[PDB]
Amino acid sequence: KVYDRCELARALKASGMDGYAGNSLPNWVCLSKWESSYNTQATNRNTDGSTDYGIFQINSRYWCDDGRTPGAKNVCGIRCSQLLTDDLTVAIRCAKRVVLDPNGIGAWVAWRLHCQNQDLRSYVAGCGV
Ligand SMILES: CC(=O)N[C@H]1[C@H](O[C@H]2C[C@@H](C(=O)NCCS(=O)(=O)O)N[C@@H]2CO)O[C@H](CO)[C@@H](OS(=O)(=O)O)[C@@H]1O
Numbered sequence: 001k002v003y004d005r006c007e008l009a010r011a012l013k014a015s016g017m018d019g020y021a022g023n024s025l026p027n028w029v030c031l032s033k034w035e036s037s038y039n040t041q042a043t044n045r046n047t048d049g050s051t052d053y054g055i056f057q058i059n060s061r062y063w064c065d066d067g068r069t070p071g072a073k074n075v076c077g078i079r080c081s082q083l084l085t086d087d088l089t090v091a092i093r094c095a096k097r098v099v100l101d102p103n104g105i106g107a108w109v110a111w112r113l114h115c116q117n118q119d120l121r122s123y124v125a126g127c128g129v
Pocket residue numbers: 044045046047048052056057058059060062063098101103107108109110
């Protein structure tokens with residue numbers, strides 16, 4: 001599904017992402033925007049054999065199993081295909097596990113590049129959340 005920015009802002013706020021491990025909502029909307037353009041079916045293969053999956057572009061080397069990644073760990077305990085559904089439940093549960101690591105939200109390249117140190121007001125503007 002391709003989410004509308006406010007539509008996504010409301011689903012994330014409903015699922016407890018606002019303030020999760022100290023990451024305010026706008027951080028989460030900004031990274032989804034730059035990482036997948038809000039598309040849950042986004043896939044991106046990497047030079048190394050892994051693939052990025054979903055709205056948060058979660059990587060198959062460490063978090064999910066796609067059956068074709070060399071030395072994969074599957075920390076979230078899921079098939080990567082579950083990260084591609086219109087229903088964000090599993091993606092959110094795994095994004096939540098990813099930010100508990102020491103690198104926090106800096107695990108996301110697109111957050112580091114387009115959101116870190118920015119004015120993210122605009123990503124939740126007009127959502128009434
Ligand atoms: C969310 C998540 O899975 N984050 C992980 C991040 O995943 C990236 C790769 C990038 C990708 O686009 N890489 C480009 C490489 S290539 O295409 O040039 O091959 N798109 C994904 C999201 O930003 O990869 C790591 C290792 O570099 C991990 O850090 S870590 O140190 O925990 O493991 C983080 O776990």
